[PDB]
């Protein structure tokens, strides 16, 4: 039964068949339980260690790297030889990457926790009910409540399910709805029916929400709805039915995975076609066998030399590392795949009390009526200065100072803004300042009061605590508060009764302080007040009063204004039922108009700013706020979002004229708009999907598991650190001050992060280009293997690895936030990128090969068979071309292979400098510039000297140590890479852009 708010409390008993004094039979609890099932949100998948091992091998790349495992295990056992010491080192060492890889991504998981699994933190273990079956009230299982069922609840317990209210027992009954909103503030409940069906959560006075609180009083109710049927599972399964995509750079690594695939089997294919020439030979003779084990040789090392297998490691600790550096910036991003996200972040949506305001009120001014006379009409205008809810300031009247008590108006005035409110003051020693007890707008109200001390009461002699609340305390024993009709949306204003303190034996002297909203109090007045005296309300002076409460809301100003009144002969306190909100309009009628106080909810210091980068950046900002339409564009003009005097009639919308609008012009709306006022519950969420129908990065901010579907939704969901543990769990980034500056600077810090990544990026892809340049070289020139799988992967994961990491540290452009945002579609290299890369591959595979021919050729230690090419034989079954010699081992001396590794170590070095700017050549921009990429690289340096005299490496390896002329050979081969790049930046700089 969905629509309980709206029936009676009979028709929800009537309904169910069940008697609210004795229950539930359990007869009807059996049925009831089969029909809508026990009362709790659905489990999460038991995702299974088994199947999330088996998800570490789900990827393209890995599998072909097992594979790899896989032959290489093979030919490391198919072989003849001895040293098993050094055989079967590959096949363990690839074997045991995609062991740490997938030991690392089941890491993740278990620590990982979802926003569904958040939801399960607000619902209670038990319930108490009333059933048929028993006397007195039993306490069972939250799981085991039914719709229908009769409960009970009280101050302290965690409301069970959606519950339809049908008697309080206490004397009012209070609720922490806060977990919907985060405004602790308690709300009164009642038990008649809201008309309205389709009425909205907030207005369902008469409902208790699965997952909130009782924070005063004792109640009894009929359940209306369970399970993913309350409010909460309705926001659960929203939560659910939403995928979040993949990020641009996962997507558009993900399908460098398939292409780099189509590309390790096309040039092994290529290594076949080449050999087509063994079809052409005697089938006797020669070792076929031998020939097969050289294929699947260099299919592995083709495959490993492909591999970025270093890659994942660099982004996570780039990701890590900016991380912690954005979390200094006060932005706790929760996703590291969300930094890269945020960078390209194009849209948004702000809450603005709290995030883009300080949500800090206080009164700047005041009016009351001066004088009427006829047409001739005058009211008074006054300051109040002091912004802190300290009771320090003053009232000034054209900024002279004046005394409130010797303005009547300002009396009342005051009795109002003290009588009329739930909230206090209190001076924290601890911290050296006033704070608010109870909301900030009725704050602003008792810190008023004290300023203006209508009374001249001494309490510069009052201590500091004291000094607090001295000027109500005073108003306060002048009236006696039988009282107090709550606010509801619908009159939009709060009143309460009061009776003098003084009096014995009397029937007359009664008063009611009516504040809220302007227009319908105002509305409702037929008595203007002038002092003491009292005069009707005319046409004239309520233009006036109108005229200036919208040049105060709508002007500079955009001050939130309460209009105050009292009821002078205020209905009998027997003929009300204070049961019944939707009697308080009427009892709060024919009033006479004392005053309105404006008051200010101040733009944080840093927000004007924060919004102009944006707008150099490309980025539009959406203000999400509460105040009417008006006041809402004036906040807008205000902080830069509006141009102070330009159109917006189209940009500007409050929830009911979106509503209004069909679809088609919705989604439309929602990409020019740029303030959002009085926005409905499913608004934030469907203008995120509209926002996303036009492609565009959307940032979203809230809080409560209100906001959880639109955070979950958008892709860069923004919590408020003040903000509920499930509205952070929901969302990509947490702001740990609220503050909407902690935003952008943080996307300015993603965007600094993804320029560094597409250098490490394509530094260690465009690496392994000039690595399968080197295998596939030495193979078409039936070379003697230059380089092989154990030394590629150390490499690619600690020579190469160490400069790409110092590549993150980049330093940023300076014009990082004077472009627009990246595209999502925008490819990491291509054009003529791709050529840059294919051509420095080309040199570097082919300089590998060569430090390996030079030895073997124009070297002393190694054959001086110059142009001897070992292309001809490698199966030393003739022993032709070396005829008086036993020897044919040499092919394998391990000079050659440390010449080109050497080459391949020393090349790439000097490639993590032409990594220090995409087009900047070094003059312009030094090798110095990143001083950790210097570190680096002498680090990768000395390891790489590590394996080459430390026993047990260079023979895992099987490499020699070089000689000084060796060496000075390698810097001859491998510094020609830089003059090369440079060229290439030239002619990139010169003749391309335009
Ligand atoms: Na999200």
Known sequence: ???????????????????????????????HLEKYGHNELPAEEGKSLWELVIEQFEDLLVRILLLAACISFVLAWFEEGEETITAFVEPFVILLILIAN?????????????????????????????????????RIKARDIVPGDIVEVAVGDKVPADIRILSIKSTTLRVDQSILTGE??????????????????????????????????????????????????????????????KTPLQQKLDEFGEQLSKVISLICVAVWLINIGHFNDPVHGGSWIRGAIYYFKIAVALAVAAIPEGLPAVITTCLALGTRRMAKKNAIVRSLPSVETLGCTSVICSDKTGTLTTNQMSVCKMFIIDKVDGDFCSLNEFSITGSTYAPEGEVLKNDKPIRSGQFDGLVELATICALCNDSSLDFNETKGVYEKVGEATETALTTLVEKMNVFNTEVRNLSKVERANACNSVIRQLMKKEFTLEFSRDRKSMSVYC?????????????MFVKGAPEGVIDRCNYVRVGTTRVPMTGPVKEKILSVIKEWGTGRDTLRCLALATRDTPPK?????????????????????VGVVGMLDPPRKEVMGSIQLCRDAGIRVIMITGDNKGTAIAICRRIGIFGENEEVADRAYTGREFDDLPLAEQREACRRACCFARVEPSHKSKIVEYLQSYDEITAMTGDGVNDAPALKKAEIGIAMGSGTAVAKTASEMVLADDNFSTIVAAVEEGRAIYNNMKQFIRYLISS?????????????????????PVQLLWVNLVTDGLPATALGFNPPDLDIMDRPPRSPKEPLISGWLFFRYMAIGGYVGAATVGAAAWWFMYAEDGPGVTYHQLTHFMQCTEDHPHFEGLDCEIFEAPE??????????????????????????????????????????????????????????????????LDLTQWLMVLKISLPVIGLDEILKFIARNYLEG
């Open 1 to 31: 039964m969905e629509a309980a708010h709206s029936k009676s409390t009979e028709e929800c008993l009537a309904y169910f068949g069940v008697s609210e004094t004795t229950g539930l039979t359990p007869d009807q609890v059996k049925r």
């Open 102 to 138: 997938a030991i690392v991504g089941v890491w993740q998981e278990r620590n990982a926790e979802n926003a569904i699994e958040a939801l399960k933190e607000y619902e209670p273990e038990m319930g108490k009910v009333y059933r048929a079956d028993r006397k007195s009230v039993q």
């Open 184 to 245: 602790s503030v308690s709300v009164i409940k009642h038990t008649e029916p809201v008309p309205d069906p389709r009425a909205v959560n907030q207005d369902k006075k008469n409902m208790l929400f699965s997952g909130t609180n009782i924070a005063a009083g004792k109640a009894l109710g009929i359940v209306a709805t369970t399970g993913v049927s309350t409010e909460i599972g309705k926001i659960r399964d929203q939560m659910a039915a939403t995928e979040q995509d």
């Open 499 to 511: 009776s003098p303190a003084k009096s014995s034996r009397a029937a007359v002297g009664n008063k």
């Open 768 to 788: 392994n280009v000039g690595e399968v340049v080197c295998i596939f070289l030495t193979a078409a020139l039936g070379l003697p293997e230059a380089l092989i």
């Open 573 to 593: 306190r027997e003929e009300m039922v204070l049961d019944d909100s939707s009697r308080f309009m009427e009892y709060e009628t024919d009033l006479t108009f």
């Open 896 to 961: 050659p292979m440390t010449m080109a590794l050497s080459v391949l170590v020393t090349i790439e070095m000097c490639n993590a400098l032409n990594s220090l700017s995409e087009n900047q050549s070094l003059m312009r921009m030094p090798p110095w510039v990143n001083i950790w990429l210097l570190g680096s690289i002498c680090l990768s340096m000395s390891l790489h000297f590590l394996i080459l005299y430390v026993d047990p490496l260079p023979m895992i390896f099987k490499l020699k140590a």
